[PDB]
Amino acid sequence: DLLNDGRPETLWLGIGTLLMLIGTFYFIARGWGVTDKEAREYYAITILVPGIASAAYLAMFFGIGVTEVELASGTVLDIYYARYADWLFTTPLLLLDLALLAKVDRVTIGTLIGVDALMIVTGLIGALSKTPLARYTWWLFSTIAFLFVLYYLLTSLRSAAAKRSEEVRSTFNTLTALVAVLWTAYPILWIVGTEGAGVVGLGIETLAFMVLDVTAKVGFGFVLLRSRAILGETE
Amino acid sequence: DLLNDGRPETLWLGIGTLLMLIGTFYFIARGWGVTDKEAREYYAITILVPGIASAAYLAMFFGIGVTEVELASGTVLDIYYARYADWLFTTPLLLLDLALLAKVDRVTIGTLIGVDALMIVTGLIGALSKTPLARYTWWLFSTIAFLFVLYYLLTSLRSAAAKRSEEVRSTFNTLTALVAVLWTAYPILWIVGTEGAGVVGLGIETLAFMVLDVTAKVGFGFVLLRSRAILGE
Ligand SMILES: CCCCCCCCCO[C@@H]1O[C@H](CO)[C@@H](O)[C@H](O)[C@H]1O
Ligand SMILES: CCCCCCCCCO[C@@H]1O[C@H](CO)[C@@H](O)[C@H](O)[C@H]1O
Ligand SMILES: CCCCCCCCCO[C@@H]1O[C@H](CO)[C@@H](O)[C@H](O)[C@H]1O
Ligand SMILES: CCCCCCCCCO[C@@H]1O[C@H](CO)[C@@H](O)[C@H](O)[C@H]1O
Ligand SMILES: CCCCCCCCCO[C@@H]1O[C@H](CO)[C@@H](O)[C@H](O)[C@H]1O
Ligand SMILES: CCCCCCCCCO[C@@H]1O[C@H](CO)[C@@H](O)[C@H](O)[C@H]1O
Ligand SMILES: CCCCCCCCCO[C@@H]1O[C@H](CO)[C@@H](O)[C@H](O)[C@H]1O
Ligand SMILES: CCCCCCCCCO[C@@H]1O[C@H](CO)[C@@H](O)[C@H](O)[C@H]1O
Ligand SMILES: CCCCCCCCCO[C@@H]1O[C@H](CO)[C@@H](O)[C@H](O)[C@H]1O
Ligand SMILES: CCCCCCCCCO[C@@H]1O[C@H](CO)[C@@H](O)[C@H](O)[C@H]1O
Ligand SMILES: CCCCCCCCCO[C@@H]1O[C@H](CO)[C@@H](O)[C@H](O)[C@H]1O
Ligand SMILES: CCCCCCCCCO[C@@H]1O[C@H](CO)[C@@H](O)[C@H](O)[C@H]1O
Ligand SMILES: *C/C=C(C)/C=C/C=C(C)/C=C/C1=C(C)CCCC1(C)C
Ligand SMILES: *C/C=C(C)/C=C/C=C(C)/C=C/C1=C(C)CCCC1(C)C
Secondary structure, rough: OOOOOOOOOOOHHHHHHHHOOOHHHHHHHHHOOOOHHHHHHHHHHHHHHHHHHHHHHHHHHHHOOOOEEEEEOOOOOEEEHHHHHHHHHHHHHHHHHHHHHHHOOHHHHHHHHHHHHHHHHHHHHHHHHOHHHHHHHHHHHHHHHHHHHHHHHHHHHHHHHOOHHHHHHHHHHHEEEEEEHHHHHHHHHHOOOOOOOOOOOOHHHEEEHHHHHHHHHHHHHHHHHOHHHHHHOOO | OOOOOOOOOOHHHHOOOOOOHHHHHHHHHHOOOOOOHHHHHHHHHHHHHHHHHHHHHHHHHHHOOOEEEEEOOOOEEEEEEEHHHHHHHHHHHHHHHHHHHHHOOOHHHHHHHHHHHHHHHHHHHHHHHHOHHHHHHHHHHHHHHHHHHHHHHHHHHHHHHHHOOOHHHHHHHHHHHHHHHHHHHHHHHHHHHOOOOOOOHHHHHHHHHHHHHHHHHHHHHHHHOOOHHHHOO
16 A cells, blocks of 8 residues: 555556556657658557556556445445546557558448447446446446447458458457457456456456556557558558 | 661660650659658669669660671671660669568678679670670570579578568569569570571560560569568568
8 A cells, every 4th residue: 555545456556557658668669760651650559558548547546536436235436537538548549550450441440439438438337336236237338339349340340451461460360359358358357346246356456457458558569569560651 | 767767676665765764753653752761772772773774775765875796697786785784783773672672691692793793794795796606605604694693582582581571571482483584584585586596586676675674674663662571671
């Protein structure tokens, strides 16, 4: 409990702040010398991901955007708004990388980000719900939007990426498989965590999310920005 | 006979001038806005191939730089110095594109370019020769140097390029095959043309060299420049 406010999870919120900074700085340092046209677009977008994330973690660290929601079980919970505002801007940027990688139309991209934004906001509403029946409704509403995200990713984007070269479609697939597995752990951890079953306390959960967040931002970013697939001057 | 100067092959040299110029401009236009630093290097090198050829083809059109050679048989021939000047500076540049893709070292490049220059120079010495024995001796030597170039591509360069990404490796192999088929045609066209057995007249020979030159420069250049293999470093 670094800030001595009863929340020993700030331990994780801190490491996450740093780790996200390091990833951000690493991407910038590495993108500094890139001249390739399209490659520079991917960097700009991806740099913002851990960038925005480290700023949301610093806030959660100082416990800047948290409120309480006393459940019906008498046990009150503290909800971090920054976490959701983070995912609200970050997940759309990661999806953009994939959209750019697949070369899909602007209409499909708008729908993609839309359902994705709907996923985070509903997940927010649920977290803020008092009864376990309400939290499941909002959770189902959110997991559905997520399945839709996965759907446009595994059909539209993928079939469009299929038309690109092997180099590009090989990375799209890799990153789309990563997203499919990695992102699926969020609804799970959420429902088994403090918002659902409670098999995990506020501590370990915060640590698990941080590990997922970093892998989904710095790890994803590393695999993408490190490949030739972002290279492009087109036709 | 465009210049109406008793030589109708000018019809093929004029067309070659245009296609060489057109290709040079398409390459500049397509590369001007490319920011990929490494891709900009391939463009610079390549633009000069049809560029230098354009000039060489214009010179030959107006009959600049030509010299007569009376064979021992009595027959006399016109030797367009400009053709060998073109090749002398052009084949090395094409070879450089390949060296770049493969990422071979500077020494290899050096012996590669050196052997290519020998090939052109000895070929020109054959063209200026007075006897079939002298002409075919240099032709043979020049052809052996060609085989040396071919050997470097199929072994050293090809080996080094295999160490690179699939995309790079793929484009290198395609272009190397293109050289193996296109370049092989020059010695053959020379030996069966007015410089050799004389089965083909000066008119067709020029038509054939024009086709070969444009494919080997603009064609080759197009395949390279539109590939993802010149991206990144
Ligand atoms: C906290 C870290 C902040 C980022 C630091 C600035 C990044 C410096 C990276 O060096 C760059 O390397 C390129 C070649 O790779 C050169 O072409 C370029 O000119 C040079 O500037
Ligand atoms: C909502 C998503 C579906 C998950 C359902 C998990 C099983 C039901 C858990 O109910 C209980 O609810 C209380 C608040 O009402 C909590 O204080 C208590 O720890 C929790 O055990
Ligand atoms: C609970 C979460 C609900 C999420 C609902 C998301 C709906 C997204 C709409 O997509 C659009 O549907 C059109 C047909 O109606 C298609 O012609 C168009 O191409 C497609 O982009
Ligand atoms: C390293 C060697 C580089 C050589 C460069 C070749 C330049 C081309 C010059 O061609 C010259 O054109 C003259 C007519 O204008 C002819 O009278 C002369 O005989 C002929 O040679
Ligand atoms: C670095 C070494 C380069 C060697 C190049 C070979 C040059 C051979 C020149 O032969 C000469 O050709 C003349 C016609 O052009 C003949 O009239 C003359 O009788 C004959 O002797
Ligand atoms: C290893 C180098 C080999 C070079 C071979 C080139 C041979 C060119 C043909 O020459 C000709 O041979 C005839 C006899 O067969 C002579 O009667 C004739 O006068 C002579 O001009
Ligand atoms: C190290 C590689 C060497 C390449 C060898 C090429 C040898 C070419 C020999 O040509 C010979 O020319 C004679 C006239 O001069 C003809 O009478 C004879 O029938 C013909 O066969
Ligand atoms: C690096 C590739 C080297 C290829 C060498 C092959 C040389 C073949 C030259 O022989 C010629 O073949 C013509 C038919 O094609 C005949 O009409 C002609 O009388 C004969 O002299
Ligand atoms: C390195 C391999 C090079 C292979 C070159 C093959 C050239 C074939 C040219 O065929 C020509 O087609 C004309 C119709 O288009 C006919 O009128 C003409 O009589 C016929 O000779
Ligand atoms: C090792 C190098 C081998 C080169 C072989 C090329 C041989 C070319 C054959 O000579 C040509 O034969 C014609 C008749 O068929 C003659 O009309 C012509 O005047 C003569 O030049
Ligand atoms: C990849 C293989 C490329 C082969 C290119 C060959 C050059 C183009 C054709 O030139 C000439 O056309 C004449 C008809 O117009 C034919 O009678 C003559 O025999 C042929 O030589
Ligand atoms: C790289 C691919 C090369 C493919 C070869 C294409 C050869 C096209 C020849 O066309 C025409 O043939 C007539 C004779 O039939 C000539 O009288 C006429 O002048 C010529 O223009
Ligand atoms: C950098 C952060 C990332 C990639 C966050 C991803 C978050 C999700 C995929 C969240 C999904 C959720 C549901 C499907 C329902 C339950 C609530 C959420 C918000 C955890
Ligand atoms: C743009 C022009 C190119 C790629 C020219 C290539 C020329 C050759 C490979 C020439 C080879 C020759 C011999 C092997 C011997 C006979 C004389 C030459 C110069 C025609």
